[PDB]
Amino acid sequence: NFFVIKAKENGVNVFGMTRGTDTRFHHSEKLDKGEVMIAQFTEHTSAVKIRGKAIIQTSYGTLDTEKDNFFVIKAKENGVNVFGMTRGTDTRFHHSEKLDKGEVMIAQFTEHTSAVKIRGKAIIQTSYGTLDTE
Amino acid sequence: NFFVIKAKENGVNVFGMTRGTDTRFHHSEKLDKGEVMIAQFTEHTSAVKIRGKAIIQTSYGTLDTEKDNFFVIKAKENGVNVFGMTRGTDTRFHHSEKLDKGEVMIAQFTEHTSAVKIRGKAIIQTSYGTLDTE
Amino acid sequence: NFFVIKAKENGVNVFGMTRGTDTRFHHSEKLDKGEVMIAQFTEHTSAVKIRGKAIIQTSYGTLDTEKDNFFVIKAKENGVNVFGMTRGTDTRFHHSEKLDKGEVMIAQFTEHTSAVKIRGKAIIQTSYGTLDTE
Amino acid sequence: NFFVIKAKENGVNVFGMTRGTDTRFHHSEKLDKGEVMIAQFTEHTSAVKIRGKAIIQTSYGTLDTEKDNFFVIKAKENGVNVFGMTRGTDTRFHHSEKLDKGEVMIAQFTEHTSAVKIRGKAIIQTSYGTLDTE
Amino acid sequence: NFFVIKAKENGVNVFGMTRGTDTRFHHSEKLDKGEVMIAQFTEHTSAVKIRGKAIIQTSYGTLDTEKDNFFVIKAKENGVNVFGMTRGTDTRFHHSEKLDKGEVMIAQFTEHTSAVKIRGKAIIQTSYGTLDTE
Amino acid sequence: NFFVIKAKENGVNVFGMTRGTDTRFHHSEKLDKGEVMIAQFTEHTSAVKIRGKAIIQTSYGTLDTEKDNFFVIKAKENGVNVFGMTRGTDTRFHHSEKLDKGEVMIAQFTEHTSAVKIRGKAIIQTSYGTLDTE
Structure with a gap:
């Protein structure tokens, strides 16, 4: 599937998360006012953080x-966090992601x-x- | 497919049942007030018990x-029980699951x-x- | 696919027919008042007789x-019978099933x-x- | 796919046509008043003639x-005929089927x-x- | 897919075009008044010309x-022509088909x-x- | 999928872009007034520029x-540009396409x-x- 973004200012940023339990940001985009972005979910990127x-x-x-x-999250307030399960018999919440007020997150479901x-506090779609x- | 849960209190619990005739609980989650959970049905977990x-x-x-x-059950009263068939020529109700008033169960159909x-007394969807x- | 049953009395019975031309009943369930049953059509059972x-x-x-x-039959009266064709060049009505008033039958289409x-006299869906x- | 028939009299007949260019009738059913028939289209039978x-x-x-x-034909009058093409480079109307008033024909599309x-004069659906x- | 034709006169003609860049007519049907034709698109015939x-x-x-x-064309006037592209790197309009007023053409998309x-001037559907x- | 074009003048042009990061125009069509074009998206052509x-x-x-x-762009003004990502770990905007007012672009999503x-300023569909x- 795909998604669409539009920028209301300069400096709107995009972070791509590495697919898998090992999560870190590989990109930091910069979007000027009036920007529009189109992208896919790839084997390299299963989730995206918008700022x-x-x-x-x-x-x-x-x-x-x-x-x-896939699923959607919108941070209504600051301090918003997210956690992820590890598939398989070994079961535990591996990470504790963090988000600020107004931040948005999107992610597929991975192996x-x-x-x-x-x-x-956040909104989910x-x-x-x-x-x-x- | 997937399902969504929301917590109205602290201590909302989730039990994952081992897939197959041999059924036992491998996890006991704890959800605070305002929690929201998203999960899949996996080869390791074909059913979930919510509390x-x-x-x-x-x-x-x-x-x-x-x-x-998959199917849904909601226990209207205490003493609610469930039973499962064994696929193949060997036919008999293998187990007698038990549930209390207000408990919920979800399960796929397995081999x-x-x-x-x-x-x-219960509700089914x-x-x-x-x-x-x- | 699947089907659902509910019991209005004690002793509601279920007969599973062996898949194939050779037809006989391998099970005789007993359902009390308020029972609810869910089941699939399996390679071992292509048809079900409800009583x-x-x-x-x-x-x-x-x-x-x-x-x-699959198809549905409901016996409106006594003496209701059913017959089945044998697939392939060898063509003839192999069996003459029998049903009583109020009896129900369900069956898939088999090789x-x-x-x-x-x-x-019966109803068909x-x-x-x-x-x-x- | 499948079809359904109901008999308004005794002697309603069914002819199964051999699949392929070589066409002849392998069966001649007899249906009493109140009969109901259900059948499939098989590799052995690609068309059916109802009477x-x-x-x-x-x-x-x-x-x-x-x-x-598949397609449907209903003979509005007597003398109704049908013809079939031979697939492949060798092209010609191989046969000239015949039908009488009130007769019905059904056939799949074959190799x-x-x-x-x-x-x-006939009706087509x-x-x-x-x-x-x- | 399939199509249906009906004849309003005697002599309604059908031309089958050879599939591929090399295009020529292999058949010239003749339909009397009241004719009805049903046919498929085959590996041998990717397009049909009706007259x-x-x-x-x-x-x-x-x-x-x-x-x-597939697509449809109806010639509104005389002198109507059509052209076809050659797939692959070698690119040019290979042919210049011709049609008269009232003529109809149908064709799939080929390799x-x-x-x-x-x-x-023509109509397209x-x-x-x-x-x-x- | 496919698309349709109609010409309002003489000289309406079509440029086919080579599929892949290496982008250049392999064709320059000329359409007279009243032209109508139908085409596919092919392994050789993943995008088309209309003029x-x-x-x-x-x-x-x-x-x-x-x-x-696929996606659509319509240039509302002059100086309209477009950029493309390179799939895989090597991440950067490889090219900066350019378009003038009234120009249109269409492209699939490629490997x-x-x-x-x-x-x-442009319109997107x-x-x-x-x-x-x-």
């Missing part, structure tokens, strides 16, 4: 960064992870609908 | 723990089981609709 | 035993049978709709 | 013998035939709709 | 010869051709809709 | 050159490119809807 004033658009609908298979856990932490 | 005050959401609709392919039998024991 | 006061539910709709791919013939013998 | 007072029902709708992929031609010779 | 007073019917709708994947060009040269 | 007064029609709708999976970036740079 800055931007508009994100996907199959589940259109999301705004400022307004108060390395079968479940996810979230912390902080899926192929089934939407879900708010409050 | 505590929570909201469960699936393709068949949205279910509440307190309000009075080890072709049919299921339920006891106690499927790709076809819903069914109440009363 | 007793029960409610049957499938993709073609919901059927009642008392009210006056052993390509056509079926019915006798007695398919992926296309419903059909009454009268 | 007598009967009701035929398919994905394209419900047809009556008396009222004035031996790519096109068909009809004569007499397809996955696209219906067509009358008049 | 005479007839009614053509396809998934894109119903067309009349007199009224003023030999990836694009087509038309000349004269596709899986997307219709298009008129005027 | 001149023309009407373009695709699954996402109908576009006009003058009015003020060589996973994302694209645009510059200038996708399987999800439309997007304007303003």
